[PDB]
């Protein structure tokens, strides 16, 4: 339990630091690359790729993103003090949710494009995946977060809470995770109060929204795996399969 303001502010700076250290993509880099947009020729190229090649490429890049989220957790105060069961439960449920939130940084609301393999492209880039519902949902979600003008520090505190969620089924030290979650909640809300940003509280996504996105991801994978079981077995990252089946 964090009692003084100085303690709470120490948590804030600690969380923000752990975040900055474990982003794979610098905000500055993503912003200054925004003019670098796939041409119609390249978009057509993406649309002509097989469903299985596109899934493999997507599963690969997401897996790399997940690895940075694991590093983020390993650097988070409190997380490494939890038992290994609980560490795994939190990452299993939360890693993809954190990726989805971090993705808003790589999203340009001005033209509805996302950073993918070196350039920005709209959602039509992903048509070969055969999961437009999932894709447009992800895009709408990133759009909603972009409208809030999330700061880097807000992203750090919000993703720490996404991860440190005491309601995850299968936790052995529920009360310990609860205490960590509460301390992080005070840190997030203190920072918002300090920065006159508490108006974002009502505008943050409803809890089950992130869960809906991860469920859709799993559901689409299941269908893909049924169509291409050898591809998943032979060409999907081991970590990705472990997390998503």
């Amino acid at each position: 339990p964090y009692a003084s303001l100085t303690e709470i502010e120490h948590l804030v700076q600690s969380v923000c630091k752990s975040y900055r250290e474990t982003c794979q993509l610098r905000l500055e880099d993503l912003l200054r690359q925004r003019s670098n947009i796939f041409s119609r020729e390249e978009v057509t190229g993406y649309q002509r790729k097989s469903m299985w090649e596109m899934w493999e490429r997507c599963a690969h890049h997401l897996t790399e993103a997940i690895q940075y989220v694991v590093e983020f957790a390993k650097r988070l105060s409190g997380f490494m003090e939890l038992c290994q069961n609980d560490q795994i439960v939190l990452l299993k449920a939360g890693a993809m949710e954190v990726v989805l939130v971090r993705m808003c940084r790589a999203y340009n609301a001005d033209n509805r494009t996302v950073f993918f393999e070196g350039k920005y492209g709209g959602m039509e880039l992903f048509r070969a995946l055969g999961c437009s519902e999932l894709i447009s949902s992800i895009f709408d979600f990133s759009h909603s977060l972009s409208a809030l003008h999330f700061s880097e520090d807000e992203i750090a505190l919000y993703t720490a809470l996404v991860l440190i969620n005491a309601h995850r089924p299968g936790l052995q030290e529920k009360r310990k995770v609860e205490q960590l979650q509460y301390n992080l909640e005070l840190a997030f809300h203190h920072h918002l109060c300090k920065t006159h940003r508490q108006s974002i509280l009502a505008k943050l996504p409803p809890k089950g929204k992130l869960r809906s996105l991860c469920s859709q991801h799993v559901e689409r994978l299941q269908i893909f795996q049924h169509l291409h079981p050898i591809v998943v077995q032979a060409a999907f990252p081991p970590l990705y399969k472990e997390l998503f089946s």
Partner: peptide, 8 residues
């Protein structure tokens, strides 16, 4: 498998 190994 992997998450175990990544955590240590």
């Amino acid at each position: 498998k992997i998450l175990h190994r990544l955590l240590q």
